[PDB]
Design a protein around this ligand. Structure first.
Ligand SMILES: [Mg+2]
Ligand SMILES: [Mg+2]
Ligand SMILES: [Mg+2]
Ligand SMILES: [Mg+2]
Ligand SMILES: [Mg+2]
Ligand SMILES: [Mg+2]
Ligand SMILES: [Mg+2]
Ligand SMILES: [Mg+2]
Ligand SMILES: [Mg+2]
Ligand SMILES: [Mg+2]
Ligand SMILES: [Mg+2]
Ligand SMILES: [Mg+2]
Ligand SMILES: [Mg+2]
Ligand SMILES: [Mg+2]
Ligand SMILES: [Mg+2]
Ligand SMILES: [Mg+2]
Ligand SMILES: [Mg+2]
Ligand SMILES: [Mg+2]
Ligand SMILES: [Mg+2]
Ligand SMILES: [Mg+2]
Ligand SMILES: [Mg+2]
Ligand SMILES: [Mg+2]
Ligand SMILES: [Mg+2]
Ligand SMILES: [Mg+2]
Ligand SMILES: [Mg+2]
Ligand SMILES: [Mg+2]
Ligand SMILES: [Mg+2]
Ligand SMILES: [Mg+2]
Ligand SMILES: [Mg+2]
Ligand SMILES: [Mg+2]
Ligand SMILES: [Mg+2]
Ligand SMILES: [Mg+2]
Ligand SMILES: [Mg+2]
Ligand SMILES: [Mg+2]
Ligand SMILES: [Mg+2]
Ligand SMILES: [Mg+2]
Ligand SMILES: [Mg+2]
Ligand SMILES: [Mg+2]
Ligand SMILES: [Mg+2]
Ligand SMILES: [Mg+2]
Ligand SMILES: [Mg+2]
Ligand SMILES: [Mg+2]
Ligand SMILES: [Mg+2]
Ligand SMILES: [Mg+2]
Ligand SMILES: [Mg+2]
Ligand SMILES: [Mg+2]
Ligand SMILES: [Mg+2]
Ligand SMILES: [Mg+2]
Ligand SMILES: [Mg+2]
Ligand SMILES: [Mg+2]
Ligand SMILES: [Mg+2]
Ligand SMILES: [Mg+2]
Ligand SMILES: [Mg+2]
Lengths: 95, 239, 158, 14
RNA sequence: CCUCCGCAUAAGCCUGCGUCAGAUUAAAACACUGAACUGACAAUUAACAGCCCAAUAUCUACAAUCAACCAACAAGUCAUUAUUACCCUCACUGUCAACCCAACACAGGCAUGCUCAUAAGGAAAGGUUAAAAAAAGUAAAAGGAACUCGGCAAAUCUUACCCCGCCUGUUUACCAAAAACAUCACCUCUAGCAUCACCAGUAUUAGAGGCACCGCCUGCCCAGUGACACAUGUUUAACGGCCGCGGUACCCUAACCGUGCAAAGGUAGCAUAAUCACUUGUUCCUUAAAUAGGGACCUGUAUGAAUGGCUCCACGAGGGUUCAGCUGUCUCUUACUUUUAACCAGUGAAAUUGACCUGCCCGUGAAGAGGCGGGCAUAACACAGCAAGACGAGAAGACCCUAUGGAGCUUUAAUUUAUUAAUGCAAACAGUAUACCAAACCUGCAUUAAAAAUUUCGGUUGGGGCGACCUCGGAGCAGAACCCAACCUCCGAGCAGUACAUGCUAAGACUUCACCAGUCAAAGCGAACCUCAAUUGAUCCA
RNA sequence: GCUAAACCUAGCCCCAAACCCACUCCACCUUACUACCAGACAACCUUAGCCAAACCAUUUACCCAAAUAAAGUAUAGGCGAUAGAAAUUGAAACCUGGCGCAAUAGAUAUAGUACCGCAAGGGAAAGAUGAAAAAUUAUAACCAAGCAUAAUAUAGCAAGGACUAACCCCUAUACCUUCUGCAUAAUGAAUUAACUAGAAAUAACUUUGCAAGGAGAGCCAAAGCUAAGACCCCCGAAACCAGACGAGCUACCUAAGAACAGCUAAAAGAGCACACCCGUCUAUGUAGCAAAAUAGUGGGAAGAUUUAUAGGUAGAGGCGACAAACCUA
């Protein structure tokens, strides 16, 4: 994944991860379901409703994506009207 | 590669000239033609193919005297040494030319055709229609490039307002200017087809290498082809 | 000298391509040089000459980075030297025509000693400078006699 | 095929 | 005693057996002192051979072969003149050797002249003995190929037949010399022409190919592909191909018929062949005995005519059979000589080697034990033999498989035309009475073609290949939570039918052993008051 | 006690600073190292491929402005392996060193020499007294394998338990790797000396500092931030591409040469047969005389013959009477 670049000696990031996933500052990664816009004419409304969901990733997948991205994508952002602003923090979680 | 052609001498002469072989190689040293190389050594007799060429300070038609008829290793037909005025030259011997004969080289074209024995050169317009001819040119004064091989001959077919039509040994017809010189009769050394090589050694003496032993499968070209004769060749410029 | 894709799509083969200009042989006249030149030309420089209104104007206006020709730079140096010298260009008996051609190009004619080094490569410049400073050595006899006579004059005048 | 390995001469100074 | 040597020149090499000293040492395959050397000193003397020439024009048809008769073809190795310029002379270099190319003082390689056994030049035995095995010879009773795959080898001189290739010739330097390749002869295709090949040539020529002297012949076919004609054709001595069923008299086909198809349905000839198998086909000769050889038969169901067919002369280190001969090939081996050998003297390798104080039998065990179990055996130590074992040494098996490891070759594998050649359009030019013609070379684009280029050639598999399979569901195996393999046993699926709230949201759960996918569902907002088992396909991109 | 052993210093490495060199006479682009003669030709051009994408087919960092930061961000891309800016920021003139090597190390270097190759090209090894050698004296020994002093003793992985005694008694299937499993008769290893193989990030953990702030600008921060520690081997293909060097071997050719006794001569790509060319069969040899030889036996030997000299054609090629032949074993 180019741990060391030939120009700066820096770690690089896989841009497919950035194009496909969103990282909340707590450490959670959000993805879209596969096939959520393919052949909707053979799918039931419940299946399509569960396909339209934004879902969380595994612990293993989260660590893999953290390895595949650089620390720039893990900083705390303060956008103006972020629809995911309230999801960047964890509440009432115990160990 | 350092290749210099042996054809390097700017003055006509009668004495035979040493000719270097090639082996089917061009100036770069690579084989350009296959099956060529290593025969008997030969010398070159210089053949004057411009049959009508008057001497210095002389203008009109002239007569010549066949001194000898000799074998040429460089060509199929034999060559006649012929003297005239104060100069001698080699020309292509036609059939029934022997020592002691006289040959006419004429330029003036006549109102009525002339009677020509088998060794003279007249403009194709002055000749009768249907005569057997050889050593023909394309432009007037160009020099004989067409029929020159042993026993081969062509025929004058027609005469047109300023041109003449000639049939080649391959039966292709060509029109040339009326003032184009040609010699009457068939070329000598007939019965050249009936020569039997007898053995591969004689081919080697002739200077041709054996064919490759690789087996080539035949393509679509190999079958017999029946084509019509190609169109007329024309050497007459027209604005 | 570049490369292309087979059908202008990047997922096909890459082939090395060469694009060559269409060259033409044409004849030109120089009013400053009063000579007719045959040059291998192209449509672009024909258009440039048309825009500049004459071969002389085109050559004198275009810079070296645009003429792209040692022949053009030599022509430029020839015209510049002609203008700087104001020499008998056309011929005798036509002084007013010579002057008129000269005044057609007043916005030119850099000084004479500067117009020589126009359009000269480094090798030509070094060779010109080397032949400039040839100056075969002077015998020491002259130097010593001059020094001795100056010493004698100095000693005598005191 | 005809697999042959040429011999190797050691340096003459030894 | 040997001499198949030698002496010169060329080429190569470069002081490399001339003298003196050191020889205490050092290379001498040992030594004396000199070919496997150290230092110093000394020599190869030009007439031999190298090293040449003043221009400008011009001349140079008649081979050589005792060159004389004769006779040819493959047609050849040697010559001047005219005018101007020109009166100095013997420099320079090679000259040695026992010698060069082969890592060597190497049984190899090496041009020419001269005598072809010498007038040159050389020494097979360090000494001894007289074993085996081995090498090279000589002689051999009686027999005479009984040997053997085979008359290999040896000894004697040798008859006849067959297959293949006409012949002489060429080829895998280093395992194949042939039947293979070429080859005179025959035939097909292409080309109307000048300066760098072809060619200083011109259709009786040149080039690209097939086949293979000669003799008799080479049958039918253009449906398909290719090539040439653009008139829907021509072309097989181009790539190639030359039928099927049923009825057919006691045996067999069968002339004949009905039919279908095709371009034609294999003609002549030859024939169990160098010709799939059956096959040691059948039959006669040959032998005592014949899967061998020769001569005849054609279901040769896969013979066959320039993929050339069939005879034949001569030829062949080709492959077979044979008469006679004579031979230690053999019954059946023996004797001697030389080399080797063994001992003495001198000099002195290499592969190999975990360490070894290194036995036999039976059993065991990663399945074939010197080393383990049970027995037996057993003082130590040289020398000569032998080859049963040490799964003996050598070469990281070449056979087989595997590798998203290579490469050569062929295509009708995928991708492309950068390149060459054609076309068409554009650019460049010029007259021309509202129309037309557009020379050539460049350049850009497009198409066609030749030549190519790059890359790859899935997996499972009671080895691989071939066959079969690859996704999803139901049943058994797998009997009572779940799960559970098989190139195991059996069924199926790749849809269909009906509403169009088959709307929207949202607790809590299941889950094909991961993930991705997949499944169920309360409450709520709206609105009336879902069947089925599988029925399926991610991302990118469009 | 022989062979041996041991030794410091030639030099070298990495930095810094500074821009660095070259005619005594003679010769040297022809066959370089050549004193002295009439066609004057001439260079300027997009690398490719290995490799990665776990195949491969578009694609795959490597280019010559001090740093740092923006930032591995915008962007590019079989949107995938990977590739990747800029605006902007700001970058204190002088000081002659070494937690480098010390003869298998450090330069290949005592030297690009010897040696190998036709050529391009490849490429070594090694030395050690002392103030004085115009001190050759007696000391200085001690130490690897290999041997000698000094061969051997029934029986057995070589030892261990022992024992008064070396052996005899009893127990015991070398090591490494590879495997389901090896004493295995599976690999590797004669032996000694020297050399010879784990390189780093994200995020965590521990230990400090400061603390809603930390940090010596940039960055992070709902206890964080800063600093440190700790951490990812060695040898090996068959290949591919670019540029040079090769036809003194061999294949074919060009120029100009040479050789072929004797007999039968039919006239002759005729016959026997020398020299000469080739290599049929046998035996020997097989680390050989020889990286293809020897002896005998053979094919040809006036021709499509053999052969000396010089020259030509070269690798995406040449040449080939096609053997996938040959182009320096
Ligand atoms: Mg032919
Ligand atoms: Mg052929
Ligand atoms: Mg001498
Ligand atoms: Mg040798
Ligand atoms: Mg003598
Ligand atoms: Mg002797
Ligand atoms: Mg003896
Ligand atoms: Mg002896
Ligand atoms: Mg006997
Ligand atoms: Mg028998
Ligand atoms: Mg028997
Ligand atoms: Mg024999
Ligand atoms: Mg033959
Ligand atoms: Mg040959
Ligand atoms: Mg061979
Ligand atoms: Mg040969
Ligand atoms: Mg052989
Ligand atoms: Mg043949
Ligand atoms: Mg036929
Ligand atoms: Mg058969
Ligand atoms: Mg028999
Ligand atoms: Mg023969
Ligand atoms: Mg001895
Ligand atoms: Mg056993
Ligand atoms: Mg023994
Ligand atoms: Mg053992
Ligand atoms: Mg073995
Ligand atoms: Mg192996
Ligand atoms: Mg694989
Ligand atoms: Mg497989
Ligand atoms: Mg199987
Ligand atoms: Mg699950
Ligand atoms: Mg509800
Ligand atoms: Mg790859
Ligand atoms: Mg890999
Ligand atoms: Mg592969
Ligand atoms: Mg910047
Ligand atoms: Mg060193
Ligand atoms: Mg070194
Ligand atoms: Mg010791
Ligand atoms: Mg015991
Ligand atoms: Mg196993
Ligand atoms: Mg065991
Ligand atoms: Mg083992
Ligand atoms: Mg193994
Ligand atoms: Mg071993
Ligand atoms: Mg590869
Ligand atoms: Mg290749
Ligand atoms: Mg040569
Ligand atoms: Mg003969
Ligand atoms: Mg003979
Ligand atoms: Mg073949
Ligand atoms: Mg083959």
């Amino acid at each position: 994944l180019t741990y060391f670049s030939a120009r700066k000696g820096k770690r690089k990031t896989v841009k497919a991860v950035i194009d496909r996933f969103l990282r909340l500052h707590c450490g959670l990664w959000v993805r879209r379901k596969a096939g959520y816009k393919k052949k909707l004419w053979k799918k039931t409304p419940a299946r399509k409703k569960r396909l339209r969901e934004f879902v969380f990733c595994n612990k293993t997948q989260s660590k893999l994506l953290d390895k595949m991205t650089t620390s720039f994508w893990k900083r705390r952002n303060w956008y103006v009207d972020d629809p995911y602003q309230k999801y960047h923090d964890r509440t009432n979680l115990k160990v | 590669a350092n290749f210099v052609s042996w054809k390097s001498r700017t003055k006509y002469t009668i004495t035979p000239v040493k000719m270097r072989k090639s082996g089917g190689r061009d100036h770069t040293g690579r084989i350009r033609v296959h099956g060529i190389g290593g025969g008997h050594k030969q010398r070159y007799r210089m053949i004057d193919f411009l049959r009508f060429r008057p001497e210095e300070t002389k203008s009109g038609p002239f007569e010549e005297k066949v001194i000898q008829v000799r074998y040429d290793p460089c060509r199929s037909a034999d060559i006649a040494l012929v003297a005239g005025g104060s100069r001698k030259r080699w020309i292509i011997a036609t059939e029934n030319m022997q020592a002691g004969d006289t040959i006419l080289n004429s330029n003036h074209i006549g109102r009525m055709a002339v009677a020509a024995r088998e060794g003279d050169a007249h403009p194709l317009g002055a000749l009768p229609v249907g005569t057997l001819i050889n050593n023909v040119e394309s432009e007037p004064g160009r020099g004989a490039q067409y029929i020159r091989a042993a026993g081969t001959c062509g025929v004058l077919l027609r005469k047109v307002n300023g041109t003449a039509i000639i049939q080649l040994p391959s039966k292709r017809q060509m029109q040339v200017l009326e003032t184009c010189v040609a010699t009457v009769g068939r070329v000598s050394n007939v019965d050249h087809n009936k020569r039997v090589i007898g053995k591969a050694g004689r081919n080697r003496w002739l200077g041709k290498r054996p064919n490759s032993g690789r087996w080539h499968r035949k393509g679509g070209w190999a079958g017999r082809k029946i084509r019509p004769l190609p169109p007329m060749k024309s050497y007459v410029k027209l604005p | 000298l570049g490369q292309i894709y087979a059908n202008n799509d990047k997922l096909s083969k890459r082939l090395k391509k060469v694009w060559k200009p269409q060259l033409f042989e044409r004849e030109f006249y120089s009013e400053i040089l009063d000579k007719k030149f045959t040059v291998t030309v192209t449509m672009r420089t024909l258009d440039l000459i048309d825009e500049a209104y004459g071969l002389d104007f085109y050559i004198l206006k275009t810079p070296k980075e645009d003429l792209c020709s040692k022949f053009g730079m030599d022509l430029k140096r020839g015209m510049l030297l002609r203008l700087a010298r104001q020499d008998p260009q056309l011929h005798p008996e036509d002084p007013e025509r010579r002057a008129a051609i000269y005044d057609k190009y007043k916005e030119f004619a850099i000084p004479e000693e500067e117009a020589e080094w126009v359009g000269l490569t480094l090798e030509e410049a070094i060779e010109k400078q080397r032949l400039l400073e040839e100056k075969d050595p002077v015998p020491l006899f002259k130097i010593y006699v001059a020094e001795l006579i100056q010493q004698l004059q100095q000693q005598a005048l005191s | 095929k005809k697999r042959f390995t040429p011999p190797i001469y050691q340096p003459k100074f030894k």
